[PDB]
Coordinates of C-alpha atoms and ligand atoms in Angstrom, one line a residue:
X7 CA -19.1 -20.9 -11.3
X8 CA -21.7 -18.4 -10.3
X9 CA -19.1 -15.9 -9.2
X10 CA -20.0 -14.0 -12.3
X11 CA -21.2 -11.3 -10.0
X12 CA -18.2 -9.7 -10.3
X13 CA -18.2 -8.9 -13.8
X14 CA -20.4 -6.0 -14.3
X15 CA -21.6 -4.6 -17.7
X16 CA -20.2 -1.8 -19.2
X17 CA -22.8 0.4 -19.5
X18 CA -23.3 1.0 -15.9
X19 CA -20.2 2.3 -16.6
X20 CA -19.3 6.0 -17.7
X21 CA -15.1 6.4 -18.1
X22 CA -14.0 9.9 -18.1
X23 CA -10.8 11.8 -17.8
X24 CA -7.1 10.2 -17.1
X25 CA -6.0 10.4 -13.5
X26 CA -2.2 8.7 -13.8
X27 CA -0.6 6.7 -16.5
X28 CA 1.4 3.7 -15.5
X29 CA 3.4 1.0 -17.3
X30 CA 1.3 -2.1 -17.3
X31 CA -2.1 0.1 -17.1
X32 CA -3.8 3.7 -16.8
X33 CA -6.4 4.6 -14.0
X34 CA -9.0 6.6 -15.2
X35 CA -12.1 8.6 -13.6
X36 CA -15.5 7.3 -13.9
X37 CA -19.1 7.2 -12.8
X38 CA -20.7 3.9 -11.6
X39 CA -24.5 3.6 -11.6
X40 CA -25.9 0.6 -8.8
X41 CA -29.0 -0.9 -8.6
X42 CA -30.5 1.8 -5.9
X43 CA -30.3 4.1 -9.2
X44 CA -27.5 6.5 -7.9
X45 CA -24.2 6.7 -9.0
X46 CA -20.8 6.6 -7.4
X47 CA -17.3 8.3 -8.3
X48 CA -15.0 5.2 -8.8
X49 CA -11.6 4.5 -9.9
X50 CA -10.7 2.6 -13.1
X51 CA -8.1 0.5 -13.5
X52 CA -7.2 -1.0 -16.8
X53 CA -5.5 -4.5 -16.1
X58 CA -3.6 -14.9 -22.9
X59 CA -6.0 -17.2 -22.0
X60 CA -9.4 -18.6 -20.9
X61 CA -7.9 -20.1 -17.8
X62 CA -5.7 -17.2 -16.2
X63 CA -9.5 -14.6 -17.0
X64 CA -11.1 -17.2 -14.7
X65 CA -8.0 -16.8 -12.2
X66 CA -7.9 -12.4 -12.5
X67 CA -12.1 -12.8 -11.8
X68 CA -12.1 -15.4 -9.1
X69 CA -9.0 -13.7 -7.2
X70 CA -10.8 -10.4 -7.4
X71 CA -14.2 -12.6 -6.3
X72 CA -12.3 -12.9 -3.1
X73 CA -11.4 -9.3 -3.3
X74 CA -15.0 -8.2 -3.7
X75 CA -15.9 -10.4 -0.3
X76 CA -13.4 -8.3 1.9
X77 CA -14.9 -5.8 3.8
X78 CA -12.0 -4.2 6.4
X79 CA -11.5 -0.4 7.2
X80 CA -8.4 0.0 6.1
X81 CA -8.4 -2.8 3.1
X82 CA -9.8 -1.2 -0.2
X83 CA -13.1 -2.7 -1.6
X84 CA -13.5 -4.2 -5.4
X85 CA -16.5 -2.7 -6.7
X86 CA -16.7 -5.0 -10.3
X87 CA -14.7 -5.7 -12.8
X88 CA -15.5 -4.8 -16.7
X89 CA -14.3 -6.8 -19.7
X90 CA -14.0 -4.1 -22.3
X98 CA -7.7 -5.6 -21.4
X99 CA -10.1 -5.4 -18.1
X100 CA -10.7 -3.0 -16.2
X101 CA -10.9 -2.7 -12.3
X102 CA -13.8 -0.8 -10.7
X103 CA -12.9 0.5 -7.2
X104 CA -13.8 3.6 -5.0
X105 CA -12.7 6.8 -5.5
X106 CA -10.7 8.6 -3.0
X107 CA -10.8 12.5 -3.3
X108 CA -7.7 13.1 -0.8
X109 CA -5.7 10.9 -3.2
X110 CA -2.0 8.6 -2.2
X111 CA -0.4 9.5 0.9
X112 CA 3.0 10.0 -0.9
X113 CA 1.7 12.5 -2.7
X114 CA -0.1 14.0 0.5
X115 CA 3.4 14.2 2.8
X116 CA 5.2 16.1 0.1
X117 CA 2.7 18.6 -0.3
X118 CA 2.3 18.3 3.7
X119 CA 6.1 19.9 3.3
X120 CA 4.9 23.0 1.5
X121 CA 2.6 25.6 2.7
X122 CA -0.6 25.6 1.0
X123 CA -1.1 22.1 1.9
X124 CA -1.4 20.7 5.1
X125 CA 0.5 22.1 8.4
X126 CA 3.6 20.2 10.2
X127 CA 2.0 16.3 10.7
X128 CA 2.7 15.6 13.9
X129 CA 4.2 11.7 15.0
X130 CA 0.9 11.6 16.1
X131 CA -0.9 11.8 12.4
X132 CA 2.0 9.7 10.9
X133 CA 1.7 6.9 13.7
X134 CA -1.9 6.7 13.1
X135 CA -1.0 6.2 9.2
X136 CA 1.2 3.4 10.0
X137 CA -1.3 1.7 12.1
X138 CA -4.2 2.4 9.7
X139 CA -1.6 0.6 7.4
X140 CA -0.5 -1.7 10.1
X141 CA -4.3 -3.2 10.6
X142 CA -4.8 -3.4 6.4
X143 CA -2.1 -6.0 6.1
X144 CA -3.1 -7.8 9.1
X145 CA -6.4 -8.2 7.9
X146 CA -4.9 -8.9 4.4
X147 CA -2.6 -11.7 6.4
X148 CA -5.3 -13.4 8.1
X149 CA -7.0 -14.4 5.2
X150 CA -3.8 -15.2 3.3
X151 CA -3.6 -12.5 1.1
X152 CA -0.1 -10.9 -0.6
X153 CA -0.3 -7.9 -1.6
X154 CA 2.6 -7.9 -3.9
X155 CA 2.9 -3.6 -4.2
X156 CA 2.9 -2.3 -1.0
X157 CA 4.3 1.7 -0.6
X158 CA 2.7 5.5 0.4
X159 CA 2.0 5.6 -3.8
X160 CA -0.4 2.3 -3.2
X161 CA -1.8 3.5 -0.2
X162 CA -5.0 5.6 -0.1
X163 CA -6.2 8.1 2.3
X164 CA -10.3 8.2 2.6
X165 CA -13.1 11.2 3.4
X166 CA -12.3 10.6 7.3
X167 CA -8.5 11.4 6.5
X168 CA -7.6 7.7 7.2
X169 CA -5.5 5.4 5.2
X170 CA -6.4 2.0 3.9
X171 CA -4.5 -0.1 1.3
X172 CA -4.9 -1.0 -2.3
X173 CA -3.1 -2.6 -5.4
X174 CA -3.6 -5.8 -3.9
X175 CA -3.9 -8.3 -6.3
X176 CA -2.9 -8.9 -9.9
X194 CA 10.0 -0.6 -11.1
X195 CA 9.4 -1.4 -7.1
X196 CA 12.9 -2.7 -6.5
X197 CA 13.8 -0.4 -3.4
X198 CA 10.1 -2.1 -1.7
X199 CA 11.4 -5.6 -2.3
X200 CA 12.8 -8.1 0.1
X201 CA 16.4 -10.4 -0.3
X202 CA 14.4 -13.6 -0.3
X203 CA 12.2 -12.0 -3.4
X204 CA 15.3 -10.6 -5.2
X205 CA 17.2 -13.9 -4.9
X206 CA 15.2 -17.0 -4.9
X207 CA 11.8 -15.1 -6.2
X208 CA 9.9 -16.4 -3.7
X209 CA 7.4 -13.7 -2.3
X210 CA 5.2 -14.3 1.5
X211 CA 3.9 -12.1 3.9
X212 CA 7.1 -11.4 5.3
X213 CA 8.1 -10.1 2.3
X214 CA 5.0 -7.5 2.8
X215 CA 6.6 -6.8 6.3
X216 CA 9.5 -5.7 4.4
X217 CA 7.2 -3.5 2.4
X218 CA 5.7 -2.0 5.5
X219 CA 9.3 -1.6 7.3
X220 CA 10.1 0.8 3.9
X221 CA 6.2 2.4 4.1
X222 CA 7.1 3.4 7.5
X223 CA 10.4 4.8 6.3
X224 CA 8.6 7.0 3.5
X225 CA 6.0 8.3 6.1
X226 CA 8.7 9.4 8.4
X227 CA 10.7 10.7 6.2
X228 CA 7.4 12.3 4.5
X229 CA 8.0 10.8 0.7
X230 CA 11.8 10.3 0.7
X231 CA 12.6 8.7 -2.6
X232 CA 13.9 4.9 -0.4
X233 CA 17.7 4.6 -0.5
X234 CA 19.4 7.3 -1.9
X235 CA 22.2 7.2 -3.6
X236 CA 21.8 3.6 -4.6
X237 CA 20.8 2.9 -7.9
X238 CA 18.2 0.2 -8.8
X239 CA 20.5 -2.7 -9.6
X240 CA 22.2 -2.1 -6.6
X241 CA 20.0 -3.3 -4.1
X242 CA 20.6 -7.1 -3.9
X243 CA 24.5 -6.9 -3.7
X244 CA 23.6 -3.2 -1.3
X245 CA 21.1 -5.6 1.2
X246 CA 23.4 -8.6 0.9
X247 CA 26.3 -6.4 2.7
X248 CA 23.8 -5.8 5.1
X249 CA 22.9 -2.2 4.4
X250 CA 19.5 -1.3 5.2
X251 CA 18.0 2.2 5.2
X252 CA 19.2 4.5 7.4
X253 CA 17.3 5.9 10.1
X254 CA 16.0 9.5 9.3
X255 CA 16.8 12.5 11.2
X256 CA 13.6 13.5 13.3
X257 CA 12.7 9.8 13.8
X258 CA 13.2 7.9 17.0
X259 CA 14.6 4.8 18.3
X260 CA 11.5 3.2 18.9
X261 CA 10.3 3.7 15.1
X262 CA 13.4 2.9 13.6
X263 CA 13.9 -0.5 15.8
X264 CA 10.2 -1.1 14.7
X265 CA 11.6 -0.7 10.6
X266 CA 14.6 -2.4 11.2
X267 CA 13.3 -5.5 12.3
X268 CA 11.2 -6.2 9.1
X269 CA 14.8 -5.8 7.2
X270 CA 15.9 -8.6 8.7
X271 CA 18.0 -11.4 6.7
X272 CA 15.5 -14.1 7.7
X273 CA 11.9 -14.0 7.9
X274 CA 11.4 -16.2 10.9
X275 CA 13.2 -13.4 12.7
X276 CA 10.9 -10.8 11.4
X277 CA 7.8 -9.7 13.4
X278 CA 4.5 -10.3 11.9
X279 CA 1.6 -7.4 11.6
X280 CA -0.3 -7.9 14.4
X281 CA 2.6 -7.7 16.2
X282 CA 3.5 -4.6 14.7
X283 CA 0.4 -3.0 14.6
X284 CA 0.2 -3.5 18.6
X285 CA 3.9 -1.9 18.6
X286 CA 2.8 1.5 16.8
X287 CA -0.5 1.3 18.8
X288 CA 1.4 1.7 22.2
X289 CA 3.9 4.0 20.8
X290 CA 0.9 6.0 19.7
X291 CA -0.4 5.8 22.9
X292 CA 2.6 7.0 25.0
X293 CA 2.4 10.2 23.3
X294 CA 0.8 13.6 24.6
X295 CA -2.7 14.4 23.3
Ligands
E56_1 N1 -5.5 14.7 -10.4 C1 -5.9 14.1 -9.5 C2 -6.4 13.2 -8.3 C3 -6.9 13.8 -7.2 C4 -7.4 13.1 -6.2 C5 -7.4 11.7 -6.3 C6 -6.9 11.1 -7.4 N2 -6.9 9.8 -7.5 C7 -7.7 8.9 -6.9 C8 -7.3 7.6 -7.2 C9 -7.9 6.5 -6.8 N3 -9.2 6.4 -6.3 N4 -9.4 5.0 -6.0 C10 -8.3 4.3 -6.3 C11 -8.0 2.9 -6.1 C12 -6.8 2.4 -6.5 CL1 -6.4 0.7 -6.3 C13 -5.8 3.3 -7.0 N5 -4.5 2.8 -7.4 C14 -3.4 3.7 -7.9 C15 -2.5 3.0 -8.9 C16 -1.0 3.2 -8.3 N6 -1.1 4.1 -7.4 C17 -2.6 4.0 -6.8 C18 -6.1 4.6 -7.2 C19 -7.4 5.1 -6.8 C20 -6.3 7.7 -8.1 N7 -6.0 9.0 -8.2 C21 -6.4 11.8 -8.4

């Protein structure tokens, strides 16, 4: 109805250089001016009917009313394939950001205690996300954006990834929230192991006939028991076994807090 709020006009919008090419879109740079007459650096994300449009705005309506720390906020949406308006993060993905943590110019060793606190930034995201009933659908350190405050908050919620994917989604292509808790079991496993490519070794069209053998991923060398038990039980077979995120975020929040300053 009047949710039209979310489409803004094009000419408040100024496109500029190519930050990453995709497969089913490209996410540009860009310039948003608001109604206070400033303008804000924002991402641009590009992407047959009159009746899924109404679904791609009124999803991303919802979008636009979340407001969480660590959940990413819609800005707007343009028409002109559309094209997804959200904030721009200058530190960039948190894959990225552990790999160049590895070499020497960047960042210096993360401690467990940095990596901890990205899990539970992470952690509190999809629990906020789960509340209101909300799959994300691509959930992995390449979707997950670190802000100004170095402090990670989701994104690419909304409307390949095998490795991220659960049994129940590979078999009877059903996808729920547990399914994200399998996405956050293998987050957890690329933040330890600081951007390990998941499952190595394996090939792609391995993975159903890999997880139905019941081989997970391994648990890395530095990490500890209380991590990988933490990663391990979002791999489980069935999802009424697995924990949910608030259950895990309290996990990593003790952890976190067992450890010295
Ligand atoms: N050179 C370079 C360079 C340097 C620093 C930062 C970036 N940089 C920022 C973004 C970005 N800002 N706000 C986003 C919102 C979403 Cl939703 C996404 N989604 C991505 C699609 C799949 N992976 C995430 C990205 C952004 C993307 N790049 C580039």
């Amino acid at each position: 109805n009047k949710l039209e709020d979310v489409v803004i006009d094009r000419n408040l919008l100024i496109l500029g250089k190519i930050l990453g090419e995709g497969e089913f879109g490209s996410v540009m740079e860009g310039n948003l001016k608001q109604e206070d007459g400033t303008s804000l650096k924002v991402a641009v994300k590009t992407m047959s009917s009159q009746r899924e449009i109404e679904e791609f705005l009124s999803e991303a309506a919802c979008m636009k009313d979340f407001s969480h720390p660590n959940v990413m906020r819609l800005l707007g949406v343009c028409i002109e394939k559309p094209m997804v308006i959200l904030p721009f993060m200058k530190y960039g993905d948190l894959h990225t950001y552990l790999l160049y943590s590895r070499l020497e110019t960047g960042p210096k060793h993360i401690p467990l205690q940095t990596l901890l606190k990205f899990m539970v930034d992470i952690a509190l995201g999809m629990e906020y996300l789960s509340n209101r009933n909300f799959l994300h659908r691509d959930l992995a350190a390449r979707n997950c954006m670190l802000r100004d405050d170095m402090t990670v908050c989701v994104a690419d919620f909304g409307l390949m990834p095998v490795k991220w994917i659960a049994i129940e989604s590979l078999a009877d292509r059903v996808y729920t929230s547990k399914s994200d808790v399998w996405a956050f079991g293998v987050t957890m496993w690329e933040i330890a192991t600081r951007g390990m490519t998941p499952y190595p070794g394996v090939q792609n069209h391995e993975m159903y006939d890999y997880l139905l053998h019941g081989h997970r991923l391994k648990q890395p060398e530095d990490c500890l028991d209380e991590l990988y038990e933490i990663m391990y039980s979002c791999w489980r077979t069935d999802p009424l076994d697995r924990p949910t995120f608030s259950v895990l975020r309290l996990q990593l929040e003790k952890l976190l807090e067992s450890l010295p300053d």
